[PDB]
């Protein structure tokens, strides 16, 4: 039972440090797009997704308590 | 101990859910900025910032894979 747990938490840490790495690519377009100028949509549309990896990313820290707590349970 | 190990796990995990609060609050504050126009320099200090917290929440993945090491053995 530790181990099933285990792999699925090792899973959830994999994708926080992909979804990190995307919305630093984002963060460093938006940079780029402010710097050179662009039309307010670029910016709302580059806004959109990453408010969107945010809340991904909200949800990962949910079910990692939720694993630590099994592992803790057992 | 896989007790301490555990509280470890827990204090990474209340750093993090405190970045992503943070985080979320800056994005919402970029938004306005976006929205109600500002200095360009106000925009690019804010998203210093957020990239900074981004920064954080993947330093974060890495520790925590590291502590899991350690409570698998």
Known sequence: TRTEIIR???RSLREQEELAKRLK??????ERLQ???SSDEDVRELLREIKELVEEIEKLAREQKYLVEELKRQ
């Open 25 to 30: 690519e984002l963060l460093r377009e938006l």
């Open 8 to 10: 699925e938490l090792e």
């Open 35 to 37: 710097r050179e100028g």
